[PDB]
């Protein structure tokens, strides 16, 4: 076996210099980052995206250094907002939530829209917010005009 051996690659799904979102595995949120190097472990195998290690710098956390990511924790940078009128229960989107202080600005989490209400006085959005392998149901989402479409690589 050769999990310890790696080489650079230019044939990862994401490329050096690409602006991406990268997911912190300790707290489950996505952050703006840039890919600075792409390596691939196990040179004995045919090239697999599962073997790619992305080396990223988080835009707002330079003190974290060059962080290594599994391919599942990198995706193209979110760029398109799904406006209020287009949001629907069941959509999985990236949105801003603060689990510790839910009235405040927080971090960017993936979330499944769970309830959408329009009353005479407010637009109310609720979502099941993903943290790692688990989710918090029915979080009230403050930032209803900044919900992002997730860029999926496809298959
Ligand atoms: C984590 C993240 C946040 C924003 C606002 C955008 N546009 C992309 N990624």
Swiss-Prot record:
Indicate the quaternary assembly.
Interacts with DNMT3A and DNMT3B. Interacts with DNMT1; the interaction is direct. Interacts with USP7; leading to its deubiquitination. Interacts with histone H3. Interacts with HDAC1, but not with HDAC2. Interacts with BLTP3A. Interacts with PML. Interacts with EHMT2. Binds hemimethylated CpG containing oligonucleotides. Interacts with ZNF263; recruited to the SIX3 promoter along with other proteins involved in chromatin modification and transcriptional corepression where it contributes to transcriptional repression. Interacts with UHRF2. Interacts with FANCD2.
Q: Where is this region: Tudor-like 1?
A: 12-79
Notes on the domains: The tudor-like regions specifically recognize and bind histone H3 unmethylated at 'Arg-2' (H3R2me0), while the PHD-type zinc finger specifically recognizes and binds histone H3 trimethylated at 'Lys-9' (H3K9me3). The tudor-like regions simultaneously recognizes H3K9me3 through a conserved aromatic cage in the first tudor-like subdomain and unmodified H3K4 (H3K4me0) within a groove between the tandem subdomains.
**Disorder association:** Defects in UHRF1 may be a cause of cancers. Overexpressed in many different forms of human cancers, including bladder, breast, cervical, colorectal and prostate cancers, as well as pancreatic adenocarcinomas, rhabdomyosarcomas and gliomas. Plays an important role in the correlation of histone modification and gene silencing in cancer progression. Expression is associated with a poor prognosis in patients with various cancers, suggesting that it participates in cancer progression.
- Tell me what this protein is called: E3 ubiquitin-protein ligase UHRF1
Cell compartment(s), UniProt = Nucleus
Q: What is the effect of changing residue 61 to A?
A: Impaired binding to histone H3
Q: In which tissues is it expressed?
A: Expressed in thymus, bone marrow, testis, lung and heart. Overexpressed in breast cancer.
Q: What induces it?
A: Up-regulated in proliferating cells, and down-regulated in quiescent cells. Down-regulated upon adriamycin-induced DNA damage, in a p53/TP53 and CDKN1A-dependent way. Induced by E2F1 transcription factor.
Outline the segment boundaries, as ranges, of region: Tudor-like 2. Answer: 86-153
- PTM (free text): Ubiquitinated; which leads to proteasomal degradation. Autoubiquitinated; interaction with USP7 leads to deubiquitination and prevents degradation. Polyubiquitination may be stimulated by DNA damage.
The cross-link Glycyl lysine isopeptide (Lys-Gly) (interchain with G-Cter in SUMO2) sits at 149
Q: Identify the species of origin.
A: Homo sapiens (Human)
Q: So what does mutating residue 32 to A actually do?
A: Impaired binding to histone H3 without affecting the protein folding
- Specify the effect of residue 24 to A: Impaired binding to histone H3
Q: Per its database record, what is this protein's job?
A: Multidomain protein that acts as a key epigenetic regulator by bridging DNA methylation and chromatin modification. Specifically recognizes and binds hemimethylated DNA at replication forks via its YDG domain and recruits DNMT1 methyltransferase to ensure faithful propagation of the DNA methylation patterns through DNA replication.
Specify the effect of residue 21 to A. Answer: Impaired binding to histone H3 without affecting the protein folding
């Amino acid at each position: 076996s050769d999990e310890d051996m790696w080489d650079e690659t230019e044939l990862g799904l994401y490329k050096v210099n690409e602006y991406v979102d990268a997911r912190d595995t300790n707290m489950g949120a996505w952050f703006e980052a840039q890919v600075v190097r792409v390596t691939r472990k196990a040179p004995s195998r045919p090239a697999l995206e599962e073997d790619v290690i992305y080396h990223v710098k988080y835009d707002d956390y330079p003190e974290n250094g060059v962080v290594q990511m599994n391919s599942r924790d990198v995706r193209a940078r979110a760029r398109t907002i799904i406006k209020w009128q287009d949001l629907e229960v069941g959509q999985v989107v990236m949105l801003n939530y603060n689990p510790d202080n839910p009235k405040e600005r927080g971090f960017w989490y993936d979330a499944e829209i769970s309830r959408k209400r329009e009353t005479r006085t407010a637009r109310e959005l609720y979502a099941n917010v993903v943290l790692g392998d688990d989710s918090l149901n029915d979080c009230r989402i403050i930032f209803v005009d900044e919900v992002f479409k997730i860029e999926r690589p496809g298959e």
